[PDB]
Amino acid sequence: MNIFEMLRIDEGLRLKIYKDTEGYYTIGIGHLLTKSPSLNAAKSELDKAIGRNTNGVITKDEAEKLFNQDVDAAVRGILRNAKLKPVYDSLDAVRRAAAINMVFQMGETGVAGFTNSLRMLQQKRWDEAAVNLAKSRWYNQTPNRAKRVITTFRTGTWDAYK
Ligand SMILES: [Ar]
Numbered sequence: 723m724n725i726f727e728m729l730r731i732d733e734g735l736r737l738k739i740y741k742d743t744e745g746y747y748t749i750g751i752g753h754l755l756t757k758s759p760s761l762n763a764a765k766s767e768l769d770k771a772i773g774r775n776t777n778g779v780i781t782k783d784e785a786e787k788l789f790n791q792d793v794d795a796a797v798r799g800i801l802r803n804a805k806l807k808p809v810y811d812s813l814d815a816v817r818r819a820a821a822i823n824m825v826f827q828m829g830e831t832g833v834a835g836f837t838n839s840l841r842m843l844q845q846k847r848w849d850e851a852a853v854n855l856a857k858s859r860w861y862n863q864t865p866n867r868a869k870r871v872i873t874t875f876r877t878g879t880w881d882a883y884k
Pocket residue numbers: 800806807809810821
């Protein structure tokens with residue numbers, strides 16, 4: 723297992739524009755298009771992203787290409803964030819993938835807001851971190867996914883995904 727497989731399980735794959743858990747227009751493997759309530763606006767953003775007149779539909783390869791860029795951007799966003807980078811560098815491989823999933827889902831910004839959890843992960847206090855991470859809107863709104871990511875940080879293994 724790895725980051726790609728992990729996120730492919732959490733996000734799914736859809737080839738037509740859809741609304742995510744927050745009601746935002748998305749396509750592919752969790753590629754958010756826009757926070758706007760306009761379907762047209764989402765179609766405009768999709769065309770621009772792909773570089774062709776898609777009409778709300780893409781191929782598997784295009785979805786996978788967006789996905790690669792989004793993983794890459796997430797990692798780079800972590801590395802560029804003063805609050806995140808040090809946490810990240812302190813973690814082992816498995817846990818790093820848990821950190822990436824979270825940023826992919828909620829943005830750098832969002833993640834950089836779990837100050838307390840961040841600190842406990844940096845100190846390797848796994849159980850305490852797991853409990854603090856669960857005290858969040860993230861967990862209350864997408865409890866199944868959150869539990870998988872949380873178990874990942876807790877144990878450092880991929881059992882939640884196997
Ligand atoms: Ar992180």
